[model samples]
Target: SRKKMGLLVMAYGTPYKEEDIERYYTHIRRGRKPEPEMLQDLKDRYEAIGGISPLAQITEQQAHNLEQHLNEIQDEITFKAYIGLKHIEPFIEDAVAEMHKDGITEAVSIVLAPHFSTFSVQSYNKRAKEEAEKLGGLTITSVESWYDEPKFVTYWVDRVKETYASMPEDERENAMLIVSACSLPEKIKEFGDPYPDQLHESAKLIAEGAGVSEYAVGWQSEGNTPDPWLGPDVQDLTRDLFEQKGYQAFVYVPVGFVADHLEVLYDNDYECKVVTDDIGASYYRPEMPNAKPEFIDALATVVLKKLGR
Candidate 1:
């Protein structure tokens, strides 16, 4: 006999087009506009990735698909899906307001990022709470993290096994798997942040499930901060692995990222690919699980378990 439940899907948003880069970048920098040279550099990276990240569309599809899954799986409780982005239009606050306006009094806010970090996922939940306070009469239960969800891990296990099986037997032997996450400032360990370790845990699970023996767990897309970020960087790891084990082919598992974005498209595909190419090695990565059936089903399971459906 519950009211229509709200599923608030939160994610790090992306610009809709090349023309919106400045707005998106400016929002990311907390209203400070990027320098002309650097802005152009960022846009050039966008151009390299076919002039736009597929993140926005993928995110929308994720929410759309989630709504369907919840509605169909649990007939007792009707579900309404809403999207919220961290650094762009239709922001989290706005999404909450929309929910309020639509007469939603309770919601389960889940950030698409699986791992929980005070610096990352926590902030999204915080923002949702803040907005709820301002709007009044909104009950928000934010999922802190779902990195260890059984189906989420299982789906990745299958994806890894499938991608690995596709490679030729000889190439598989020469291929070294590199599991990576977005690096954060090392000083966060002073506050005992669990993000770094959580990512490593995910790598451990995936490698163990997929039976990947020769692999390195490290970092990619380190931030622009001057402080030291998590290591070893993908370039260094790949280089050292090649030098040490004579491995020539590499498969990158960007387990940190869920969708096709600038980080994966530019950082991993373009930048890291350049390094591997320069070393005369081949690089490959499985497609991200963006709105895929497995991912949507995993998400459905997380929500059902959360709400006791």
Candidate 2:
């Protein structure tokens, strides 16, 4: 009688093995591999960083932490948090099935990714909706994108300010901030998705707060595709900043990411770092706010506000 309510935290799950990369990319590309040669490149990135993303694990921890925090703060509410992945183990249906078995007839859906696009949140919510129907008795209240939530915005602002304060005062003037997202502005426009716009708003807030005068918004973790994506990609931007703008200091803010996962380490830190160094730009990327106590607390507040609690 302890678990009548469920909290579903959904995510864009990553492949855990080298061979699994093909299948993962195939799914994302809708049965088309982005490139023949890039499969190994993609596989090696994940391989280089422990062969798995700690994303799902981090989501689980955040969910549990939020629930624990909420319970501690408020009395008379009983619920359990469950992690659901769109493309991998602990898949949507199985998670729902388990919830049903646990007598959970009501759920609050939350995606770990703060900013939303149709491709990201829609995919996760769609599967959850379908599963809820099949299970037949649960009432699912999906927490739509929290991109503009005050607390989330404030979290970004505070983090950006912290990053700015950490830098040398002189370099802070020309400092550029980059937010990483898989969905590019151009691609989102083609698909008529609002993710880029929403992400831009968040970026604008962070930039304004940090007093960033020069910066560029771009996409990361893109597959090898001839089809153009949003740019300038972070690596390309590094060259443009130095060669064209004569920019000196750069801060790679993975704004689109909440955790330090493969993308942050490989794409931004390793690949982007190398390119930026070659272009003679001083680069810095602050740690991800993944499971930051403030973030977790903010998440709980967002969930409750969505439920009108």
Candidate 3:
């Protein structure tokens, strides 16, 4: 009998619309209902970004694109792709169960996140794997991290160059280049996680490839928890660049994310933009790799390599 493959693409989920905000927030908190203030904060953020997250829709499109790519290139194998969310409807367990019902014997799961940490990508994989086990032990392979993939690095290099060219010539030379990503709690280091190191490594690769001589790495979109998260935050760095370094413009490269979710839309665009305006410096960020052909190609390459094709 021939082997059948299932491609499970996992992402951090978001609310579908304004009405779903409280339910989504509660789900993220692991079933504990969000307090009124917390719920309102999230509601306002979602409202600011057009009352809906395109993440779920984008991930579905990615699954379709990746499936087409695989089938086009590989003649001997059959591949089916499904989208799963860690914190939303069509959950990981349900996705795994669907794969089993669809007669897929082997599956490769990949999180949309480029860099991996125990708390994030690994957790998503664990959930999927456990559910697969419950449904008669479907064989599972998880792609650990693709932060250093050449194509992935090249994509960001191009983005950085384009964003830099958009800056005025006078400010271009003195402008501060800051590469950033979602901030994780600093305590992950106690477990010997390599997230911070990998993030910085990705940043360095893009900066070098883009011919940027001076750049800095910072964390962004940290949670409200009291525990210390990674830093210095992107806002703080922007302030320092304008006030202390006397830089006149800022270009932000969000190396950690591939899609336009609340993080990119609200945290970076709105929150960080305010900081730049207050400091009297212009702000710019490259477009995210949402359903772009090159990004789909990069993802397909990672999937093929993981399956040994």
Candidate 4:
């Protein structure tokens, strides 16, 4: 008999509608209600990005696509895919519980983020593992990061080129390429986290493959806490490139993320655009690998490798 296998695709979920905002925010705060101003700010951000994020829907599509790809490529193993969210409904524990109910005895988990950090990917993997244990008699494997995977790197390289080509011919030559990811607290390095190094390596590989000689790496969407986070933010970098470096156009590649979320939509598309406008420069960001065939293929490849196929 073939063993039942579940592929859990983990992500930081977003509210599906305006009515769900408060509940979603509460979950993110871990039951502590957000202050009125903070809550309003979040709402405003969401409003700016269409009042809801497509992350959950996109992740679900990724799961189905991966499941289809896996079954098509391998006849010996049957695969079922599920989406587990960290801060919203369909939580990791619940997803695993459902899997247990469905007679899934063995599973593999993968967070959508490419770069691994103790604070991010490891945390998701930890929650999934704990939940699987709580359900009893389930064995699970996790793929922590695939930042330097060849297909992953190739996706960025191809996207960057496409973005560059989309620019006006005159501006393409001087467009400063900026690759960015969510900014984490600098304190994470004290624990010897490899996230920063991993992001840098991924950026380097993509730039090399794209034949881009003059590109910069920046961090974005940092938390509003008082604690200092990573440096050279994308906004600030854009200002510097335009004012000091005499660059007239910019292209942004969100190297750490796989789909379009608030960070990519509101932060890169809206907030970063404001910065560029102020500096009298143009801003552009490439399409994310959201359920794109190649992106799903890359994910399938990662899962298969984790499964020892």
Candidate 4 off by > 4 Å? none
The models' CA-based lDDT, in order, is 0.86, 0.75, 0.86, 0.86
Model 3, which residues run further than 4 Å from truth?
1-3
RMSD for all candidates, in order, please: 1.5, 2.8, 1.7, 1.6
Worst 10 residues of 4 by lDDT: 48-57
Where is model 2 poorest over a 10-residue stretch in terms of lDDT? Answer: 179-188
Please say which candidate is ahead in TM-score: 1 or 2. 1
> Positional deviation of 246 in candidate 4, in angstroms?
1.4
- Model 1 ranges off by over 4 Å: none
TM-score of each: 0.95, 0.87, 0.95, 0.95
lDDT of 2 by residue, 1-309 (tens): 343468887876766556677887788677886587788677677767665646446766777887788666656567688878876667877788888888888888888787777767877888888988987888788876886777777787777778778777777776777766765436557678887777778778777766766667777877566767666677876777678767667788777877767778888888888987786767788767777788887888888887777
> After TM-score superposition, what is the CA distance of residue 4 in candidate 3 from its true location, in Å?
2.6
Q: lDDT of candidate 3?
A: 0.86
Question: lDDT by residue for model 3 over 1-309, one digit each (tens)?
Answer: 445789898988877767787888787777888989988888888778776756567778878888888777778667789888878778888899999998888888899999999889989999999888888758799998998889899999998898888888988888888988889999999999999999899989999999988888999988767899999999888887677787878888888888888888888899889998888888888888888888988888898888777
In model 3, what are the clashing residue pairs, if there are any?
A: none
Q: Which stretches of candidate 2 lie over 4 Å from their true place?
A: 1-3, 16-43, 50-56, 184-191
As for candidate 1, its clashing pairs are none
Residue-level lDDT tens digits of model 4 in 51-133: 57565678888889999998888787789998899878898888899999998999988999998999989999998999889
> lDDT by residue for model 1 over 157-221, one digit each (tens)?
88888877988888777888888888888887988989988988898888889998878887988
